[PDB]
Amino acid sequence: EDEWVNVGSKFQYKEDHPFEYRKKEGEKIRKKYPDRVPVIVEKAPKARVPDLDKRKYLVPSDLTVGQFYFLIRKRIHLRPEDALFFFVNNTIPPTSATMGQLYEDNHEEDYFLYVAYSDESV
């Protein structure tokens, strides 16, 4: 109302595409797909992990953060031994939480959820 404004670290999608442009496609999606969530997934700067082929994702609102984590690992083509960690607003999100709950708490003003991944906790 009285609702917190979420500011995150520097994402590349947040360098390529002015806020007025990022915003626009944001409200366009949530009206076209109310049951799903727009998520931007990028590699952390110093992280030693393979870069993601595609970084724009439409995720079901009732899918857990943990399930999306295993989904990304399969896309990064990590093996069963590799370490990977999500950072949403520079904090590691709970696995039990749903992507809908995570979006509602950590979406920026452009109606985009930003998830960063690394092999360490920075």
Residue numbers in the entry: 0 to 121
Task: Tell me what the authors wrote about this structure, in their words.
All six mATG8s are essential for autophagy, are conjugated to autophagosomes and serve to recruit two broad classes of molecules: autophagy receptors and autophagy adaptors. On the other hand, autophagy adaptor proteins interact with mATG8 proteins on the convex autophagosomal membrane surface and can regulate autophagosome formation (ULK1/2 16), autophagosome transport (FYCO1 17), crosstalk with the endocytic network (TBC1D5 18) and autophagosome fusion with the lysosome (PLEKHM1 19), but are themselves not degraded by autophagy. Structural studies have shown that the side chains of the aromatic residue (Θ) within the core LIR motif are placed deep inside of a hydrophobic pocket (HP1) on the Atg8/LC3/GABARAP surface, formed between α‐helix 2 and β‐strand 2, while side chains of the hydrophobic LIR residues (Γ) occupies a second hydrophobic pocket (HP2) between β‐strand 2 and α‐helix 3 (reviewed in 3, 23, 24). To provide a molecular basis for the specificity of the PLEKHM1‐LIR interaction with the mATG8 proteins, we solved the crystal structures of PLEKHM1‐LIR in complex with the LC3A, LC3C, GABARAP and GABARAP‐L1 proteins.
To obtain the complex structures, we created chimeric proteins consisting of the mATG8 C‐terminally fused to the LIR sequence with a Gly/Ser linker. Crystals diffracted to 2.50 Å for PLEKHM1629–638‐LC3A2–121, 2.00 Å for PLEKHM1629–638‐GABARAP2–117 and 2.90 Å for PLEKHM1629–638‐GABARAP‐L12–117. W635 interacts with E17 in GABARAP and GABARAP‐L1 with distances of 3.5 Å and 4.3 Å. In comparison, R28 in the GABARAP subfamily proteins is always hydrogen‐bonded to N637 with a generally shorter bond distance and the geometry of the hydrogen bond between the arginine and asparagine is close to optimal for a hydrogen bond (N‐H…..O angles are as follows: LC3A 16.6°, LC3B 48.3°, LC3C 26.7°; GABARAP 4.7°, GABARAP‐L1 6.9°). Additionally, in the GABARAP subfamily structures, this hydrogen bond is stabilized by coordinated cation–π interaction of R28 guanidinium moiety and corresponding Y25 aromatic side chain. V51 GABARAPs’ side chains are in close proximity to the PLEKHM1 V638 (3.8 and 4.3 Å for GABARAP and GABARAP‐L1, respectively), while side chains of residues in equivalent positions of LC3 subfamily proteins are further away (LC3A/B/C V54/V54/V60 – 4.2/4.6/4.6 Å). Similarly, GABARAPs’ L55 side chain are closer to the PLEKHM1 V638 (4.6 and 4.8 Å for GABARAP and GABARAP‐L1, respectively); LC3A/LC3B/LC3C V58/V58/L64 are distanced to PLEKHM1 V638 at 5.5/5.4/4.3 Å. In the GABARAPs complex structures, the corresponding R67 side chains are flexible and the salt bridges are absent. This is likely due the increased flexibility of the GABARAPs D45 residues, which are not visible in the electron density maps. Superimposition of LC3C and GABARAP‐L1 α2 helix (having biggest difference in orientation) in other projection (obtained from structures above after rotation in 90° around x‐axis).
